[PDB]
Design a protein around this nucleic acid. Structure first.
Lengths: 55, 100, 271, 88, 129, 51
RNA sequence: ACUAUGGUUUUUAUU
RNA sequence: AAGCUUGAGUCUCGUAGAGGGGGGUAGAAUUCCAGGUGUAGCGGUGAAAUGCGUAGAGAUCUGGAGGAAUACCGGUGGCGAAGGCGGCCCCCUGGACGAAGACUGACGCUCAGGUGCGAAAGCGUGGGGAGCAAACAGGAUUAGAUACCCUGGUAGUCCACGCCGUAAACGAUGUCGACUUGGAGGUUGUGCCCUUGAGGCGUGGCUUCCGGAGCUAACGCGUUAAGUCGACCGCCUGGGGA
């Protein structure tokens, strides 16, 4: 939420599989879910999250 | 003028000599009357894979106001000195309060 | 750019013309000329050791600086001009101190451009600095293979050499035959790629053009007298044999490298 | 579509005011300024055919207004073509 | 913008009763108002009203009764591409006497009754039943 | 099935009782990309006779 | 890692 | 002939896009070189060979060369006139859409002929070639193998550019204005009332499958209609031959 650049904050919102739970079974807001899945895209492009599970 | 973030990853155990290496080329933007709002560390962060042999970065933020016809002259000034990767320029809207 | 010619004659129907509007028009700098004496393919005792050459205009040579240091001295491109031999033109450089010299023009064949020399110059085509100061993947023209020499690699239109590995006093760079050579990092080159890049799109033209170019006709070994070429003899139009040179060595599959002294620079050749 | 200043200019310097946008001679000038700004984009982009598709219609809108103006008043039409760079 | 104003008038009437609406509205014209006059004066609509000076607009109040549908077939016959005309001796019959015909004549929009009582022929405006 | 469960198993999996043909499991609900939607229905439950 | 080759014709409608 | 103005055109400030082009750029890997650690096998099959090793392969680490496309995210989720457009930057750019104001004053809407937009294959002119791959070679399989199997490999795949004009261009809905019915699952602009309501009335634009009315031979279309009414343009003539 509002940030994507700090991993010590971002890691509180994701599973240990790098995923999120679908919005309608967590009662979360529509654009908040899109902005969360986009914060994960931006954090992968910032090398804070992996492209491969290898090594 | 136009605004850019320009963030350097920076090795944490050379983070006292790497900002001086960036300042070895800042003449390329202060020659154009660019204004530099910190060129300073934000905080240590951990990576999902190693960059310059290390899984960590010190994150040094430039925060610059400059003309638009000099951002390609600045990124070409770092084309061969091996300190710039994947741009990290992040154009427009300018810095947040104390970069949070 | 390169253009076709009018089909109104043989040769002219296939011949190509090289054109550029940014060449200077005037009088060439004569202190940088060598009139270049001809040999007709003859040795110093008057005997033919190279065939198929003689006649045509004198063409001559335009002299480049074989002692080019000029470290820290800024310069400008004073002239861009036609050369009777060089396909990629020749540029006249005028230094802030203090002579006029010829230099090999990189891609874009630009006039009125300001250029530098030495370990402090910005990395640009036509900005010269030692291979000690450049990264892997870099492109060079006018390359010397021994430090301080007048250059011997990448001087023809569209030519270049690329550096692919480095360690201390030596760089590893690639050559157009599938070779890869180890070269001293104190070599300076002239940095970039040789311009024009279209002179390889050419057809000879009319048969009398070879005579102004100084190029002489061949002779078929089977029509020559039986003792002057091993293919001779006759009678007639039967050759029941494997082909040779005029000296009786097979033309195919005979590999000739016999040097025994330059292996130390090789990184991709095989015996 | 052009910037706040690139239009005005034209609408007040060739026209009368930015609240008189609809005047026929001024709409032909606003199309000419839009065409010439894209003559700085095309023939520098030697392709860009999916954006050049816009410039193809801008000369058609200028043809629509010029022909309708030539049928609306021949003196205003004849004045306009020597006050803009039209008919070479 | 509008290529047939009266095809929109007739569609707005015919489908308005099939949408069970009390009233329908359109840009007003002295042709639409003359068609609305004969439709009121022969008892097929309840009221027609105009409002405006620079944008005049028409509202038609649809007629309802104990049964189903007051207008059962409302067919134009004559269109601006291909027009259909009728003469004094042959002024038309509509649904064998269940309906009536409307004509523009040389005088104005009227019934085939009011036309045959002046000796007039002309263009068909509508057949109504 | 693509499972990562390790250690205390024998007889080459197929460990779930009635997993294919005449039910269980799923295909209730076979059409229109909704195959795994009844798992969500019986988890968001709550009542099944709703008005 | 699996076999070419055996053609052609057929019925209930009346009280 | 001259007006009027709601539909048409433009302008302030805003919304969302793998639409286009120019100049840059990762993650990782088949291949290939080299230095460690290390040993006789790798790959395929009902069996096998060709090929790659035994000179150190395959393996796994360390460091590189190489050209070229997007996995995880990703959702029929977006964009474009359409075949097409997806890792990520910087710089230019056509079009769609709204809130409140201001001009033009019939400006709409379809288009004969015309002039325009390429997906793949193929080509013209040069550059390039990591993996793959028509043609073709190397070995089996088989009656044959013309194919499946299997190792290589040219044309090609790619680029800056120029031709070609064609399709399952299929969301098979010619284009354009108006009038409409309920759902699932996604998305975006905005006015109004102490929010008598810690809250609720009113309204514009898109998007993918369902399923009504209406439409059909039946399948299906279905507010992004194949529906109701209207404006303009195009095409067809029993089959095969062709």
């Amino acid at each position: 939420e509002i940030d994507y650049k700090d991993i010590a904050t971002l890691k509180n919102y994701i599973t240990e599989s790098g995923k999120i739970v679908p919005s309608r079974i967590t009662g979360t807001r529509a654009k908040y879910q899109r902005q969360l899945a986009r914060a994960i895209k931006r954090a992968r492009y910032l090398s804070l999250l992996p492209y491969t599970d290898r090594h | 003028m136009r605004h850019y973030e320009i963030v350097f990853m920076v090795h944490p155990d050379q983070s006292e000599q790497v900002p001086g290496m960036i300042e070895r080329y800042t003449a390329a933007i202060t020659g154009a009357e660019g204004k530099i709002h910190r060129l300073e560390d934000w905080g240590r962060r951990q990576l999902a894979y190693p960059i310059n042999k290390l899984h960590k970065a010190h994150y040094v933020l430039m925060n610059v106001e400059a003309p638009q016809e000099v951002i390609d002259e600045l990124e070409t000034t770092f084309r061969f000195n091996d300190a710039v990767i994947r741009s990290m320029v992040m154009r427009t809207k300018h810095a947040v309060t104390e970069a949070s | 750019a390169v253009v076709k010619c009018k089909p109104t004659s043989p040769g002219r129907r296939h011949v190509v013309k090289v054109v550029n509007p940014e060449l200077h028009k005037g009088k060439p700098f004569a202190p940088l000329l060598e009139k270049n004496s001809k040999s007709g393919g003859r040795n110093n005792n008057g005997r033919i050791t190279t065939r198929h050459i003689g006649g045509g205009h004198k063409q001559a040579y335009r002299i480049v600086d074989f002692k080019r240091n000029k470290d820290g001295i800024p310069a400008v491109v004073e002239r861009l001009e036609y050369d009777p031999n060089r396909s990629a033109n020749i540029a006249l450089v005028l230094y802030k101190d203090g002579e006029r010299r010829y230099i090999l023009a990189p891609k874009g064949l630009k006039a009125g451009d300001q250029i530098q020399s030495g370990v402090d110059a910005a990395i640009k085509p036509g900005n010269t600095l030692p291979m000690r100061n450049i990264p892997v993947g870099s492109t060079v023209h006018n390359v010397e293979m021994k430090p301080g020499k007048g250059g011997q690699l990448a001087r023809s239109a569209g030519t270049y050499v690329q550096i692919v590995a480095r360690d201390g006093a030596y760089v590893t760079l690639r050559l157009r035959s599938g070779e890869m050579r180890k070269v001293e990092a104190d070599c300076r080159a002239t940095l970039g790629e040789v311009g024009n890049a279209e002179h390889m799109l050419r057809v000879l033209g009319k048969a009398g053009a070879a005579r102004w170019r100084g190029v002489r006709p061949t002779v078929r070994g089977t029509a020559m007298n039986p003792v002057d070429h091993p293919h001779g003899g006759g009678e007639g139009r039967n050759f029941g044999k494997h082909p040779v040179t005029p000296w009786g060595v097979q033309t195919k599959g005979k590999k000739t490298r016999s040097n025994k002294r330059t292996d130390k620079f090789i990184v991709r050749r095989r015996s | 579509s052009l910037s706040t200043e690139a239009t005005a200019k034209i609408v007040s310097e060739f026209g009368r005011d930015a609240n008189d946008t609809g005047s026929t001679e001024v709409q032909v000038a606003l199309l000419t300024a839009q065409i010439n700004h894209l003559q700085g984009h095309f023939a520098e982009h030697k392709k860009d055919h999916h954006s050049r598709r816009g410039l193809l219609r801008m000369v058609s809108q200028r043809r629509k207004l010029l022909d309708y103006l030539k049928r609306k008043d021949v003196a205003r039409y004849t004045q306009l073509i020597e006050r803009l760079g039209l008919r070479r | 913008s509008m290529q047939d104003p009266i095809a929109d008038m007739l569609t707005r009437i015919r489908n308005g009763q099939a949408a069970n609406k009390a009233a329908v509205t359109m840009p007003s014209s002295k042709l639409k108002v003359a068609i609305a006059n004969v439709l009121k004066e022969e008892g097929f609509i309840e009221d027609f009203k105009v409002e405006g000076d620079t944008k005049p607009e028409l509202e038609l109040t649809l007629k309802y009764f104990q049964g189903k549908a007051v207008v059962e077939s409302i067919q134009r016959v004559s269109r601006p591409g291909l027009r259909i005309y009728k003469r004094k001796d042959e002024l038309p019959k509509v649904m064998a006497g269940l309906g009536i015909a409307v004509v523009s004549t040389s005088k104005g929009v009227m019934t085939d009754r009011a036309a045959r009582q002046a000796g007039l022929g002309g263009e068909i405006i509508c057949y109504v039943a | 099935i693509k499972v990562r469960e390790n250690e205390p198993f024998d007889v080459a999996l197929r460990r779930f009782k009635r997993s294919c043909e005449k039910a269980g499991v799923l295909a209730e609900v076979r059409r229109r990309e909704f195959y795994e939607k009844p798992t969500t229905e019986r988890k968001r439950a709550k009542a099944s006779a709703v008005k």
